[PDB]
């Protein structure tokens, strides 16, 4: 729901401007005419719209499926970084599986002892659930997972099928994924891969003859395995070697990259035939994720260098690179066409006309379900849980659920803010600072909504573009991360519908090489109010990718890109889970409704179990955080706040008394519009349901402590409508969708111009 | 559906956590010993749990073998709140909720674990854990929540609530299929399920429908009847039989109209008071002997006989009408008008049982309302005996 003024930029959003994102922060800004051309067939991104249930297996050990997860648990909630994370792997496998001691004891306790070694046909079937009981004492991991990866390892080796009963049933949650590669990400999907080797390395073919070189002629003694396979998991692991580093692969690919975009490639070296005729560079120089992952880099490196084993070697090795790329990441390769199908575009206008106002948009759908489940504990000491899910509470909520999908719906949105702009016998115009510009990306804010942060600290960063340089390092850099999905979505949209561009190279600050940014070009109409450039000849050379957006006409999205409800129902019932605590949320709500009554004050309390019309209550209990729904909200949320603040500022700085009057105007017009969207969710199953609660709660207050006849004031036109607008918001809180503290500012915004109308 | 519990309990019974052995030299196992292994196993507060999924496995373990079937454990059903509060018929579907639960554990397939393992002798055990915990699981994952228990009665009672109203509104007034429903001419005519819709209102201030129907609630549910049928307290009685313990009786004037008048419950006292003193068979468990030691029990019995005689209600109603009458007649509506006193020790016998004190629910009668600070289960005893 981010607003922005299309002329100025740098003032209007610094943190969009490509300027901006090469590392050009000065007054200075890309100079319209340079040299060299390209187009952009396709690109990667990971996937909107997906949460998946993954099995792991009796076995099977998938090398890719682990090498998969372990991006989701860095991703989904911050651990970390998913190279950070597999360095841990590798000294817990090492004091783990490399080591006998460890070993032995573990073999000790499934059979039959530590020291006697007895061929025992006698020995019967053992539970996997039990290794992980010894595991969690013996290797005190802060990562469940890895506890599986070496079971089934383990569980892969001994199957004769008399000592190993396959049977469990384990499973991880594959949410939403941030959209765009950022280049430490690519780096994260190189390190990803190194995984991918390491895996597929443990079970092998070798390893499948363990269990047949001794499955001839019958059972032999146990207390000798725990040396040999001790070292055996060393011998795939030190097979495996780091070789090339992950940081270094990228880093070298992506300079090269660069060096063949570029108008200038220096006397030294340029690219080989033989690396350009390398299988796939036609994809990836054509690629713009890659791209905009070369501006990340050489901004934060501010340098490229090279390992130098090509010309020769990335040409053989790697493409791997690719593979990379291609299987273990969540950023699968896609169409460039293709990826921008849920953004659509559409313009306000004037007669003649220019737009005065400019609409980007995803179309999303809301709904279907919002899931609550209780979870339930197994074995002491794990995050091993059966979640059940407990509905008629998932699905009460679920019926106030439609509703608010329906009243809050992206389409719904972009009508009410398109056909608002209009001022005083129209015209225009460059006038009130020219055509305005807002951006919903819900995709965007569903990041820091599922990290726990604020967005509008995001947002903030976006018109400012300076991050507090006191905060603590893991919340920057969840921020920045943030700030780069904006970037990224933009840039997508921007180039998807002008592909044909060119890349130029900057002077640089030190000067040290410098970055290599984008220009269009686009066809149009004569005369411009828009944000500077020539026009020259109909047509537009420009920098940033706003501009080049900004000549564009309406567009129809394609898709609807339906956000799922997961599903615990048909599985968790019956199985075992991931890190499911920072993902959902404990269910519980308490609000007060207050109001004065001749010259005396009445309070009523509710609780969240009352709403639903339930009793007692059961703390047990908690709802998966609808972490979508929320960014959707976030949109109109957004920009009434943020319209508010800016006219409030608006009308002061303008000295015309025909201006201001069109100023109150826009502020109290639209303020209704929300009172009016909230006063619709104040009546619902729970709305009411609220309502009823507090002024039940009043009158039974109003008894004893008085006559009843005061309550005729309840019922009186205002505060009638009073706790009407409360309880929408208190719907809306009590379900994943509304922050106290946001709607604390919001309904201070229905109070900051007066904004009620009586109107009979 | 834990098979780490269910590995660590058959390795407990015999003879090994590793080695399996078909074993015929094992002998019988007590069942007492596998509750002592399930209080440190799973610990949870109410000790009922531990019996049920026991002699579940007493159940399953029965080639006679393995399992002695020797115990003797008891449990007091005492007095009861005599009518259903309308959440107190959520938990009565919610009780038949575990009807179906527990006659799926106890099966036609559990019993087939006795025919299968029969043949042709005993087995090695280190299966049978394995298998049990798929056994119970099957037998956990066929009854599924299903139905809401709130929703049901919920509407259930709304469409009651539309039949019985003088208004039906245009939209939605009941089908004459649904109204054929067998038993809903019985449902109609339940006076306990008035006063639940009565309660149901006043708290929840609208009515709404699972709109399953017009079909679903004719065919889906009856089962509304069979959980009110069975598993209930509350068994459906002839509103004519209800009122048998209860009598009236009224002063006069000369005329006359009555003075006072008295509705009472006719109560016999007595006759033994028991004197008890527990004795635990096992630490951490509430799991106690008691031996009752008399001569305390029939000292006091004899002290209590008495008091029955001193303080029976036939006393109390008679006592009690000969004392409103004063000078020269003839009345009146002087004085206040006509008395009315009403004894009912069922229900006060509730709050002594529940540690409150019966002047505080008998005070909220007289004014209506009800101290707002107070915790929540104390309230909430409250208004469930206001209610009764």
Redesign the interface.
Known sequence: GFNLKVKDLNGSARGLTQAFAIGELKNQLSVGALQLPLQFTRTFSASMTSELLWEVGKGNIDPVMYARLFFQYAQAGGALSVDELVNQFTEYHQSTACNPEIWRKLTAY???SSNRAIK?D??????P??IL?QLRTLAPSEHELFHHITTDFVCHVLSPLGFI?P??AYVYRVGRTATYPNFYALVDCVRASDLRRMLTALSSVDSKMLQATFKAKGALAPALISQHLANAATTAFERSRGNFDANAVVSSVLTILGRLWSPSTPKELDPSARLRNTNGIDQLRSNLALFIAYQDMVKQRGRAEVIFSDEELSSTIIPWFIEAMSEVSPFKLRPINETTSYIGQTSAIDHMGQPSHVVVYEDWQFAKEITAFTPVK??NNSNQR?LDV???IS?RMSATLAPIGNTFAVSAFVKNRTAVYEAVSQRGTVNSNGAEMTLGFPSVVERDYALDRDPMVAIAALRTGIVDESLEARASNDLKRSMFNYYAAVMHYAVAHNPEVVVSEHQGVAAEQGSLYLVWNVRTELRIPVGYNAIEGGSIRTPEPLEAIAYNKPIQPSEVLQAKVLDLANHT??IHIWPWHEASTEFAYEDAYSVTIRNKRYTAEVKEFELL????RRERVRILKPTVAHAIIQMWYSWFVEDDRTLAAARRTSRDDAEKLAIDGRRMQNAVTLLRKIEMIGTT?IG??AV??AQ?RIV??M??RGLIDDSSDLHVGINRHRIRIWAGLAVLQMMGLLSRSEAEALTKVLGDSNALGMVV
């Open positions: 499934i059979t039959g025992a006698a020995v019967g079937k053992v539970p659930t039990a009981e009963l049977d469990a197994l074995a059966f407990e509905p008629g699905d019932t019956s019309g339930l009793g007692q199953g009411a349901s009823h609660l039940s039974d207050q008894a004893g």
